Design a protein around this ligand. Structure first.
Ligand SMILES: O=C(N[C@H]1c2ccccc2C[C@H]1O)[C@H](OCc1ccc(F)cc1F)[C@H](O)[C@@H](O)[C@@H](OCc1ccc(F)cc1F)C(=O)N[C@H]1c2ccccc2C[C@H]1O
Lengths: 99, 99
């Protein structure tokens, strides 16, 4: 599909059997979701953006479905104000910016 | 042009007769640039990012060229980690997300 930017580009994603709303964020290097339980071991990581850094848990090889498109990649979990789908997964679904 | 996301979507912008590099960020509602001097009066604004909020200066009706496309809109100036072109200006240049 083609998504305009008049409003925030929010989409439904499926992860860990749960349906969640997330933002397609080209300004985010990685994907970070609000606190939730994921399987496997994780590594602590610090990510920074506007306002500073937050500590998140890094999970690798996580399967996520974005608008029906399956993608695998690293998913960070932490106190993010909104679920963010970053470039690491946007590339997997073939998302591009066009103008 | 069509921009993939394997790397950060950085583009050259021209503002105040100077060239700067900025990130095309669909996750940013507004456009915020690193500390610089702009003409006119400014109004205060608080923007919240992944790590919290920062205070910025809001300038209106500012001319800014993005990848050769001329836009005139609101530009925020403050302690942002990188120059960000947000949805307010992305819409002016007709930028869309596609996949
Ligand atoms: O922190 C970032 N990347 C980092 C990141 C993110 C996830 C995982 C990893 C990493 C590392 C970086 O790429 C990005 O910022 C640019 C940025 C880029 C590279 C870098 F180096 C530092 C840096 F700041 C960030 O994901 C933005 O795309 C966006 O996040 C989603 C979001 C939306 C609504 C909201 F209410 C709160 C939110 F957070 C955001 O902060 N939006 C806010 C904004 C920005 C400018 C002007 C106004 C407003 C209001 C609101 O939309």
């Amino acid at each position: 599909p083609q998504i305009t930017l008049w409003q925030r580009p929010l989409v439904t994603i499926k992860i860990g059997g749960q349906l969640k709303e997330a933002l397609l964020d080209t300004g985010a290097d990685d994907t970070v979701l609000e606190e939730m339980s994921l399987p496997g071991r994780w590594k602590p990581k610090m990510i920074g953006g506007i306002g500073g850094f937050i500590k998140v848990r890094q999970y690798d090889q996580i399967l996520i479905e974005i608008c029906g498109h399956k993608a695998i990649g690293t998913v960070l979990v932490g106190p993010t104000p909104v679920n963010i789908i970053g470039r690491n997964l946007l590339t997997q679904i073939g998302c591009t910016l066009n103008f």
